[PDB]
Amino acid sequence: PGIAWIALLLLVIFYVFAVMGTKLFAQSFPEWFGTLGASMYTLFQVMTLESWSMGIARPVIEAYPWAWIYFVSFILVSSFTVLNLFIGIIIESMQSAHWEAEDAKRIEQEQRAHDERLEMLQLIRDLSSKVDRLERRS
Amino acid sequence: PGIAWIALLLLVIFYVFAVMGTKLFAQSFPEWFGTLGASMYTLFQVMTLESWSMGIARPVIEAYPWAWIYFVSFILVSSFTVLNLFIGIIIESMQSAHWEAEDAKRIEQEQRAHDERLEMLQLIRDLSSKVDRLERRS
Amino acid sequence: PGIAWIALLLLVIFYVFAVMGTKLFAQSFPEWFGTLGASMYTLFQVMTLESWSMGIARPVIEAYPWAWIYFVSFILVSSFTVLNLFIGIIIESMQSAHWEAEDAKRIEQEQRAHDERLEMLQLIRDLSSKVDRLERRS
Amino acid sequence: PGIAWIALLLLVIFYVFAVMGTKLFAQSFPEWFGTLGASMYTLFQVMTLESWSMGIARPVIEAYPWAWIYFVSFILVSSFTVLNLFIGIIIESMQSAHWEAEDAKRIEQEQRAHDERLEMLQLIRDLSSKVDRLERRS
Ligand SMILES: [Ca+2]
Ligand SMILES: [Ca+2]
Ligand SMILES: [Ca+2]
Ligand SMILES: [Ca+2]
Ligand SMILES: [Ca+2]
Ligand SMILES: [Ca+2]
Ligand SMILES: [Ca+2]
């Protein structure tokens, strides 16, 4: 398993949508969608929210007015799995730098005293056997 | 309740302002605010700050010179209830993955020794009952 | 007293800079820096990094070629005292929604047994006198 | 060394890349890469994703087709070694306003009852040497 597991999913979405868009727009916007290789570029350009609608979406949507859905969704999904991936890094850093190291520094402190108690206990019971061996001796 | 509760709120702010925009600018920016759906689009774009100002705000502000307040507010609000949503996940995931788990492991490893303590205590007053039972017997 | 103290500071930076730019560029970029309240806009737009350079800076810098330091520094400072403020919310949220109620659950779980151990102690000294009065009573 | 150590790294990449693009695009794109401190600029602008591609890269890629790798990877690398640094601020901020304080108040609270325990044991042992000097007396 892993984080670099969404970066697979994401790089899947990235490919999924790239070809999806070559299929539609390569037709009429052959500089943006003319090949797969430009889609990849344009889709990275588009993920980076740089003249995404004004530049690309609008004039495409100019053509295929439903294209909006294609652009909007892509952005939603794309950026959103980066949020899930940006988070994956916050977590697997924020419960790694401190929380995996204390995670065991108090897993160790705590069992370093069920060790003191359970000996102290054993000590008081060799007291009870020494005392209760002197109501059986008085 | 929930954090998919601000996703309701946001998706109202978004519809509020969409109808606000359409009612206003539909008139003279009918490309952007021509329909409710048109503004729903524009405002996604404005939210993604992609030629948001140079593209939409400023030209809407030339015509309607107070629209800045509209646009700057919508941005401030919308984006702000995403910061309020983006953290709604770093929290609900950073204290759900590390700190829901330990929350019970140290809730446990503490109440596991009110066990050892309160029983070992008992052992001592059973010893105190056996010894004080032998100054009243010596 | 709080996080809104940078909000103040950042609302300072915003004001200082909006005047400095009015005094400089009002002159030749009046639409952007003509009034105070339009440098306020323009620097809201600069802060949002929307056509920031290619739309404002490049042009201002065509004219005044040291204005770069102005823009860059503003951006740096601005988005930095925001990174500073953005975090002053993850922090003031992640040790407030979890690390505040535990912070008192196990400052209280702790002091619930300096109050057991320290009763258990006496009860053991009360066994040390009643026994130490039996090497002298034997 | 730490957060400010990737600021060295980032400030490395930034430099690396600037001279590269000056040794490359200084020729044909001299507004952006004519000099060093124009690549330094353009690169800042390119980093902040302001017209990075439609403005710079796409036209640079109009000259040199492979130039794409140059801008993509700068963004990938650059923006990435800030995710790395941004996060190095939530971390070295998160477990530092709440967790460099508790990790010592709980290094302490634990150490104050190795001290309670330890003295209690001794108290039990001296209780034992007293009892065990009373099998041998009775
Ligand atoms: Ca533009
Ligand atoms: Ca149009
Ligand atoms: Ca904790
Ligand atoms: Ca005007
Ligand atoms: Ca020029
Ligand atoms: Ca050209
Ligand atoms: Ca404890």
What is D6-59 written as a DSSP string?
HHHHHHHHHHHHHHHHHHHSTTT-HHHHSSHHHHHHHHHHHHTTSSIIIIIIHH
Ordered by start, the domain boundaries in chain C are: 1-138
Q: Give the span between the Cα atoms of C86 and C90, in whole angstroms.
A: 7
Centre of ligand 1 to C-alpha A51, Å, is: 6
User: Which of chain A's residues have a Cβ under 8 Å away from the Cβ of D49?
Assistant: 48-50
∠ CA B107-B108-B109, rounded to 5°:
100
- Taken in order D51, C85, D78, D5, the sign of the CA dihedral is positive
CB-based contact B67:B57 (threshold 8 Å): yes
Cα–Cα distances in angstroms (integers) from residue D42 to residues C52, C70, D18, D30, D54, in the given order: 12, 15, 9, 11, 13
- Which residues lie below 8 Å from residue B36, measured CB to CB, with a gap of 6+? B18, B19, B22
Residues A46 and A74: their CA atoms lie apart, in Å, by 9
What is the rounded distance in angstroms from the CA atom of residue C42 to the CA atom of residue C80? 18
Length of chain A: 138
DSSP count for chain A of H helices, then E strands: 6, 0
Name the residue type at position D53: S
Tokens coding D105:
């108040």
Choose among B54, C29, B43: nearest CA to A55: B54
Nearest to B128 by CA among D126, C120, C117: C120
Set of chain D residues whose Cβ sits within 8 Å of the Cβ of C54: 45, 50-51, 55
Beta carbons of B54 and C50 less than 8 Å apart? yes
Among B14, B36, B45, the residue to mutate for chain A (most A Cβ within 10 A): B45
Instruction: Specify the 3-state DSSP secondary structure of C35.
Output: coil
- Identify the residue among A70, A76, A95 best suited for mutation to test binding to B, counting B beta carbons within 10 A and taking the highest: A95
d(CA A45, CA D57): 10
- Phi then psi dihedrals of residue C24, to 5 deg: -90, -60
In angstroms, rounded to a whole number, what is the distance separating the alpha carbons of residues A17 and A23? Answer: 10
Cβ contacts of residue B101 below 8 Å, gap of 6+? none
The CA angle A53-B39-C86, to the nearest 5 degrees, is: 70
Beta strands in chain C (DSSP E): none
Q: Which residue has the tokens 């309701």?
A: B8
Spatial contact of C70 and C21, defined as CB atoms under 8 Å apart:
yes
Structure tokens at B116: 């050892």
Handedness of CA C109, C114, C117, C118 (dihedral sign): negative
Indicate the angle between helix axes C122-132 and D114-131, nearest 10 degrees: 20
B/e letters for C106-116, b = 16+ CB within 10 Å, e = fewer, are beebbeebeeb
Q: Which residues contact C136 (CB under 8 A, 6 or more apart)?
A: none
d(CA B50, CA B2): 30
Helices (H) and strands (E) in chain C, counts: 8, 0
Residue whose pair of structure tokens reads 């999924």 in the numeric block: A16
Between 3.30.1600.10, 1.10.287.70, 3.40.630.30, 3.40.50.970, what CATH number should domain D1-138 receive?
1.10.287.70
How far is D27 from chain A, CA to nearest CA, in Å? Answer: 24
User: d(Cα D89, Cα A138) in Å, to the nearest integer?
Assistant: 72
Sign of the CA dihedral D2, A84, A66, A27?
positive
| Cβ atoms B7, B85 nearer than 8 A | yes
Query: Cβ–Cβ contacts within 10 Å for residue C76, how many?
Result: 11
Q: Is D92 annotated as a binding residue?
A: no
The SS3 of residue B89 is helix
Could you tell me if D74 and D47 are in contact, meaning their C-beta atoms sit under 8 angstroms apart?
yes
